[PDB]
Amino acid sequence: SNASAEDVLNLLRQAHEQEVFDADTLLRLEKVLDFSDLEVRDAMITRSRMNVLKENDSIERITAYVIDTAHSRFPVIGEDKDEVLGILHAKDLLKYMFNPEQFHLKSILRPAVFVPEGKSLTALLKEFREQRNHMAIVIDEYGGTSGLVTFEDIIE
Amino acid sequence: NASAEDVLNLLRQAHEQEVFDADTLLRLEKVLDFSDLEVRDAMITRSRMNVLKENDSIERITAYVIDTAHSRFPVIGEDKDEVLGILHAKDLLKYMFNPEQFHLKSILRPAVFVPEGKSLTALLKEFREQRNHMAIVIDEYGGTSGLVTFEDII
Ligand SMILES: Nc1ncnc2c1ncn2[C@@H]1O[C@H](CO)[C@@H](O)[C@H]1O
Numbered sequence: 001s002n003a004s005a006e007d008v009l010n011l012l013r014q015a016h017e018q019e020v021f022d023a024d025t026l027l028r029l030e031k032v033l034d035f036s037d038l039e040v041r042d043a044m045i046t047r048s049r050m051n052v053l054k055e056n057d058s059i060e061r062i063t064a065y066v067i068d069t070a071h072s073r074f075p076v077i078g079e080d081k082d083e084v085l086g087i088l089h090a091k092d093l094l095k096y097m098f099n100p101e102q103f104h105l106k107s108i109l110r111p112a113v114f115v116p117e118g119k120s121l122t123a124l125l126k127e128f129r130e131q132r133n134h135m136a137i138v139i140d141e142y143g144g145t146s147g148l149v150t151f152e153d154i155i156e
Numbered sequence: 157n158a159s160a161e162d163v164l165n166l167l168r169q170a171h172e173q174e175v176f177d178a179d180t181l182l183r184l185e186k187v188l189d190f191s192d193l194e195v196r197d198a199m200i201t202r203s204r205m206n207v208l209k210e211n212d213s214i215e216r217i218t219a220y221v222i223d224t225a226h227s228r229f230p231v232i233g234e235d236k237d238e239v240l241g242i243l244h245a246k247d248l249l250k251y252m253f254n255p256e257q258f259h260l261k262s263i264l265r266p267a268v269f270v271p272e273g274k275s276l277t278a279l280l281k282e283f284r285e286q287r288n289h290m291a292i293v294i295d296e297y298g299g300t301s302g303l304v305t306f307e308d309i310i
């Protein structure tokens with residue numbers, strides 16, 4: 001026939017009132033339902049607001065910036081934010097705890113995963129869980145950087 | 157029981173009607189089929205926990221943290237039945253250019269403790285409210301049973 005999320009909601013609210021499951025479960029199911037309507041667009045941090053690291057910055061300046069912002073992962077850029085070279089994970093810096101003089105950012109930089117703004121959060125979540133990924137870079141329909149999106153932001 | 161099955165097949169029907177996609181269906185099914193789960197069911201058991209000893213040197217701590225590659229670690233005193241707090245790996249960066257100043261306890265956060273028989277559903281809720289990611293699971297006498305993470309229950 002034909003249906004809406006509304007019909008599913010009624011169906012579930014019904015089961016709860018018939019005590020098939022409890023209030024907390026009901027809230028969890030409705031949250032999943034609401035989540036299914038969302039896209040990367042809805043959870044991303046926009047380009048002009050991302051905290052990034054410059055390709056050629058010193059270990060001292062990188063480390064201070066990482067501590068200051070307290071993030072765990074950072075896009076690393078070349079000329080500007082439309083040239084993302086990779087992702088640095090804050091804790092990969094600890095490899096240089098005792099030999100900072102040997103710091104080589106390219107030695108610890110990981111490749112960036114790219115996604116479009118229209119991608120469903122359910123697909124993104126599945127891919128984050130599979131790839132053991134935590135951050136993706138969001139690309140606009142022309143190849144430019146639209147922003148970034150994180151696992152911790154979407155599981156909120 | 158007949159209540160649960162029924163809710164399920166109507167969820168599948170809503171899927172075949174384009175209400176939501178297969179990925180969502182999976183999430184919904186999981187939240188149901190597994191709504192009776194407890195912390196006990198998702199925990200990393202005591203022997204498999206990767207922990208830090210309170211008095212280990214910055215060298216030993218740092219190598220272990222890099223090797224196991226977790227982002228969070230219980231910190232213990234005498235043994236695993238004495239958890240003193242949780243260390244976030246990135247907080248070690250505080251000592252990058254002054255490793256001689258290392259004081260593990262200055263970067264140690266309070267541990268949260270939960271019972272084995274707590275529902276995952278309730279735990280999930282408390283993790284989200286508390287902006288918490290790890291809990292230490294304890295038995296009926298306060299002994300450590302294991303640890304449990306947001307990652308593992310979602
Ligand atoms: N490298 C980054 N640049 C801009 N915002 C971030 C970055 N990493 C995490 N965030 C956001 O800040 C919060 C805490 O890090 C996260 O929930 C996320 O929304």
Ligand SMILES: Nc1ncnc2c1ncn2[C@@H]1O[C@H](CO)[C@@H](O)[C@H]1O
Pocket residue numbers: 200204205206207226227228229230305307308
């Ligand atoms: N301190 C720790 N000791 C043992 N396993 C952990 C620790 N922190 C996260 N994990 C588990 O390692 C896996 C990868 O993060 C997850 O299943 C997570 O639960």
